[PDB]
Design a protein around this ligand. Sequence first.
Ligand SMILES: Nc1ncnc2c1ncn2[C@@H]1O[C@H](COP(=O)(O)OP(=O)(O)OP(=O)(O)O)[C@@H](O)[C@H]1O
Ligand SMILES: Nc1ncnc2c1ncn2[C@@H]1O[C@H](COP(=O)(O)OP(=O)(O)O)[C@@H](O)[C@H]1O
Ligand SMILES: [Mg+2]
Lengths: 67, 898, 192
Amino acid sequence: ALNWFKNEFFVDEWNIADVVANSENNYFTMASERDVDGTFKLIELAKASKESLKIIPLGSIENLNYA
Amino acid sequence: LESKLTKLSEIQVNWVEVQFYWLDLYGILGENLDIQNFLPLETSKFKSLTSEYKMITTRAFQKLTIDSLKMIKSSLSTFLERQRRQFPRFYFLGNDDLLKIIGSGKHHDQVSKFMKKMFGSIESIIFFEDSITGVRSVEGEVLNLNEKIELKDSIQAQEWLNILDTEIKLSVFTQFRDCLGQLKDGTDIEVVVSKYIFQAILLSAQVMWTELVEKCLQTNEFSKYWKEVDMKIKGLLDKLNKSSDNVKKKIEALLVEYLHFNNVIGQLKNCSTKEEARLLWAKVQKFYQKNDTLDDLNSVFISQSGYLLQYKFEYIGIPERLIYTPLLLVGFATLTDSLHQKYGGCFFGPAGTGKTETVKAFGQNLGRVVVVFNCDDSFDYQVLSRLLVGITQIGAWGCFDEFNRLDEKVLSAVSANIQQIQNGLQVGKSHITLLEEETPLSPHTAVFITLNPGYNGRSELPENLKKSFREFSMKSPQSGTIAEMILQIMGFEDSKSLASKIVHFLELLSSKCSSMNHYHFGLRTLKGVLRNCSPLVSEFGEGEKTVVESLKRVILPSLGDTDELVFKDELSKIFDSAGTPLNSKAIVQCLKDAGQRSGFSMSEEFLKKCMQFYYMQKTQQALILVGKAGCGKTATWKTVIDAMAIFDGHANVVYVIDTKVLTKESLYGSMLKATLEWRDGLFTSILRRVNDDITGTFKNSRIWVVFDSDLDPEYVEAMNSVLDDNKILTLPNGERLPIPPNFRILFETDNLDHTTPATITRCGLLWFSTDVCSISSKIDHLLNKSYEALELDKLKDLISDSFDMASLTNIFTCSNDLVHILGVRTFNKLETAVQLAVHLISSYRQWFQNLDDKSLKDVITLLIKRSLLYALAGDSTGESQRAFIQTINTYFDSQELS
Amino acid sequence: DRVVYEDIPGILDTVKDLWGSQGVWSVYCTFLLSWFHALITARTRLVPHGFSKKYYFNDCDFQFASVYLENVLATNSTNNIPWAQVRDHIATIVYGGKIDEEKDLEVVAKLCAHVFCGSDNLQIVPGVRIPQPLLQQSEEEERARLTAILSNTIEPADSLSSWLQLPRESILDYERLQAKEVASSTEQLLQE
Ligand SMILES: Nc1ncnc2c1ncn2[C@@H]1O[C@H](COP(=O)(O)OP(=O)(O)OP(=O)(O)O)[C@@H](O)[C@H]1O
Ligand SMILES: Nc1ncnc2c1ncn2[C@@H]1O[C@H](COP(=O)(O)OP(=O)(O)O)[C@@H](O)[C@H]1O
Ligand SMILES: [Mg+2]
């Protein structure tokens, strides 16, 4: 009964691939709670779109300069 | 001329240091050829320094040089980094040791002292008329190389070090091959165990065991091989009691392995069908061997649950083998699962459960020593990444112990480096780029982390880093199997019942005692009990008496008031009898002599505490002394140190360090971020000074380091690799300073509220439930000390007679009810009273030659009353002081004090 | 642009996602593995009853279980698949490594025994029945058959209770609390 509204009124849903492919913005911000990550989703999306990801974590000055 | 002698000694020490630095400079640039052309400006500076040193030497024969050498030491950093890149194992050495090893143009003897640092399980090198015959292990085992290697006079260190590194692997493989051939010929292992090194015998025995077990699995019979392995175990146990120390260690390790073999065969015999038998055989570790390999060193591979790992054939010596619990086997299985895709094996759980030792046992089963690092907040991104590029070039396995202690920013920053290392290992990349410097990647490298989650002052691993590791939980270890197998190794008659009683008694003590913050009775205390029971077999034998004595000496000193009564009741209930205690006449006499020379009085409780401390430290290396403030910890350990010096004759040096006074950068050290050199701290400086042994007396002297402050966790778990059985101090710069057996650490504190279980279990704790000295004895000792700090005998006698026990105790009990600001117990304030009264009497003695006895006694009593007032009620208001002077007037012919 | 990443709530949706992300026995084993991963991730949400605490199973566990399955299928090619060995390794090493307690190990072993039982008339859920593959089929035909039998499955309203084999009291309590929270929040939001 909770998701009946979503099932009946709305007849379309957007995933990460659609929101990446259907946005004018060149910058995307991704969020999740602790002890879970979606880096593999972005890696899979980049592989499917035939692009290259430069994974650069932050936290140190040398890595900031490289960034 | 004491000042002149001290100045001469300081000048001699400075000249010796300058001579050593100049010798290193001559070895690196002044002696070797084709080496000054690398850096021309540095060559010119070295030539100028050589000219200045020659002029100074001529002037001395008939500070500025040391300063110039220190200044040009910065210009040698690039050359040192290139030298480290030449031989990858030099990454475990500092700049000073690198200069020492590269300046050995023809002596070739300073290399041998560093083998423990570079290799891990090799102590010295055997030399024979300028030719290396073999390498010597730490545990005393002697390895003979396959062929002698001739040394050239103009050869460089790194080339012959590399050929020695390969020769060690070749020799170990040769010994394994002919040992395996001899066991295939049908001989027994009893004659082989006195002929070859331990590693070859172990590997050949494992290969033979898995081949015979697979042959038996081709049928459905298991009884004959089980009986044969049982007879072999009994024969090895018989041979254990009649062999030398090296053979004793080797036989003990082979007996551990054969006990594991018998356990696996017995588990396979109890199967009902063949499917579960095959599953159980696939779950355990197997040691197969290639039959058509043209390369010698890759002919042995390890199979477990369908995954294959390569044997490295690196020398490990005779390490302390571990008992193969089922949890250890499952940990080996998940480590092989993680390493099949070149990930990092990760172990998480409470402290004292066997994580780092499980990783080390896995490495030893894979035939390579595992270098262990102790992470800390000071391990920033550059240092940790330098350690990673150090361990990738060597190919040695890095086990980052206490991975939670890292700062979170470093934890997130090193994720890219760890992912790059994993991807290079998986894709077979020849080179990787870390720190903007392309470095080789040995295919044998791997990383492990062992973190202890859910602690105070510990960071949390981000998920993008946890996805590169594989967490495995070891919350519950198997103490029963470890205790049973170790007690069977030691030679106890009834191992099973005794081990079950030990484990049940430990759990009963854990579950039926007052739950205070330091009553931790897991696996470390059981291992300590067994290690303390090992020396007791000489004078107590293998039986119940040794076990109860070891349990007393290990557990009892860390108990309170009711807890020790509970422990005694449980010891009487669960064990058949309590043995007669040790005679201990010599140590008691030495302790009493030390106390007499130190002014203390030997009561029952203080002597009991001293004896407990002595018997605890006899096996345990690092101790924590816990008690109330002003309880007698310093007096206890100082008296025991003096007693040891009297009894054994070994000189004692004490290096008292206050932990919280100094910052960490001044305690352990700090990487100078300006141009990346290591500046020694204080504890590190002490450790390096005692390791190098310039004076030559530390070989026959004990060294005691006292951390006389609170146990701040940020200061204490920087030493987790020192407190445990690793006995190394893993510096940020890769320096692996070993802990000598005569290097003991004492912790002097008052509370354990903010400490962590990671350091309580590592040290034998000593608890002071109440004060060790009575009031009157303390007053008498303080009076004796004040008299020693200075007719006189009559004055001292009457002063001591004026301190009547009944009146003084009544005054001290009456002083407790007053309201005190800055609350101090009246036990602590007696020093002020004694010193003030003694000083007042000493000040007024100048007019005591012309006074009557009654007047003199009344004056001295008045001064004593005033001192007692101002040292007991000195921190109280006017009304309280008036009440107390009235009380002391009532409680003492004495002159009235208003 | 902002995107919030969360695990897919539906069990059938999770199976479809893991199937779209990816010998015929390898396809059968990875299908059973996707079902097992979806079931255990669905059971992870129920903290008081599904497990003892909050766990986190991600794609790495699925990848390792898939690699172990393909390694066992490749090496043990004599068509006598060691289902007990696969069950023990998956429930102890791969998916049971992160497990700290013992009851959670027991329930993971029970779930793996129900999923990887290795019987021809396998019934993982009361609706869907998966026959074992025959020896005369192609890989593309196998994938088409498994996709077709996945498409015809309909998710009942009590999938959080009936599919996971749990008593309805805990699921009713959890769904009631969640519905109460969301309904109270939307009642507060609707007024103004
Ligand atoms: N057996 C003893 N006989 C005589 N004096 C004693 C005895 N035991 C302790 N004392 C006295 O107790 C006083 C306080 O003890 P001590 O100096 O050992 O404290 P501590 O353990 O260093 O305390 P803290 O570090 O908390 O300040 C000392 O002046 C010492 O002389
Ligand atoms: N067979 C064994 N299995 C597990 N642990 C053992 C065994 N034998 C001895 N131990 C003890 O286990 C301890 C392992 O310490 P560990 O808990 O790994 O430290 P850390 O938590 O810092 O990694 C060692 O101090 C050792 O005394
Ligand atoms: Mg450790």
